[PDB]
Design a protein around this ligand. Sequence first.
Ligand SMILES: Nc1ncnc2c1ncn2[C@@H]1O[C@H](COP(=O)(O)OP(=O)(O)NP(=O)(O)O)[C@@H](O)[C@H]1O
Ligand SMILES: [Mg+2]
Length: 293
Amino acid sequence: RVSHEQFRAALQLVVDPGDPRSYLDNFIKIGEGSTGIVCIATVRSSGKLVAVKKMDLRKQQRRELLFNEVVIMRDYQHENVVEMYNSYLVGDELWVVMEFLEGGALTDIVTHTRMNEEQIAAVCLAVLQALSVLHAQGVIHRDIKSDSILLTHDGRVKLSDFGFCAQVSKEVPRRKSLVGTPYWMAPELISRLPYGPEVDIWSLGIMVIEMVDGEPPYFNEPPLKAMKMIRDNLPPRLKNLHKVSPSLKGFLDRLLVRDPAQRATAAELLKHPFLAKAGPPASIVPLMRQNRT
Ligand SMILES: Nc1ncnc2c1ncn2[C@@H]1O[C@H](COP(=O)(O)OP(=O)(O)NP(=O)(O)O)[C@@H](O)[C@H]1O
Ligand SMILES: [Mg+2]
């Protein structure tokens, strides 16, 4: 196909040259996503662990989204953003050599235990710091959920899964494509309206419900029929606010605003009294798999 070859060659120029198997050993699969698989590997000399995401060009939904997988991590070096070391083209696959995140995904934690507000705030602060930098450059993540948040062994929190990113500017102020996971999708986005970075703030709102209630709303419903409910009904509320402090409550009320214009921005939210509750990375360590019995 003229389509495949042209895209292959383009991507070739974007990525670093060569094959990482000239310095890496012990490729073992450690999980898979929608784009492709992720495996750990070892640096020959160092003996250090890294993570490698492998993505087949021929097996993509929208092939051009693969540029994000390289560019976003390269251009947004940040405390709360996964470090990318290199990107290579191996045959018909894109390989991204990035830091291995020992602590796993946030999903593992929310599905099993209940976090306290100290720990919830610490996650939100990390994500909002990451998003403020992205939104500042008109970059929307479009896939905010617990699965996109990875942890270190020492309890630091980093954002991942940039494959669905899009960029708005003064020329193109809004996106209109339908991307992201059904339950974390903003109402204006589901309605197929022109949308901006405000859709990420909503998704974060759904991720707070995840951290409090353990599920995004309507999670037990089929994906299609759940989207209709998000599109039709009022902003979802927490099950019971008896034990939720008004700090969190008032914070979540700024996230899950139906009108995008009234919804808060990452810049604004970074100053919300609630985020001052955020504990040290050490307060997150108890929540991780290894430290549970
Ligand atoms: N750097 C990393 N260190 C450790 N585990 C990782 C790392 N990156 C991804 N994973 C795990 O690998 C699994 C699947 O990879 P993932 O990057 O989620 O694919 P994906 O769903 O296609 N993301 P995207 O399509 O780019 O939004 C996830 O459940 C992660 O927990
Ligand atoms: Mg995934």
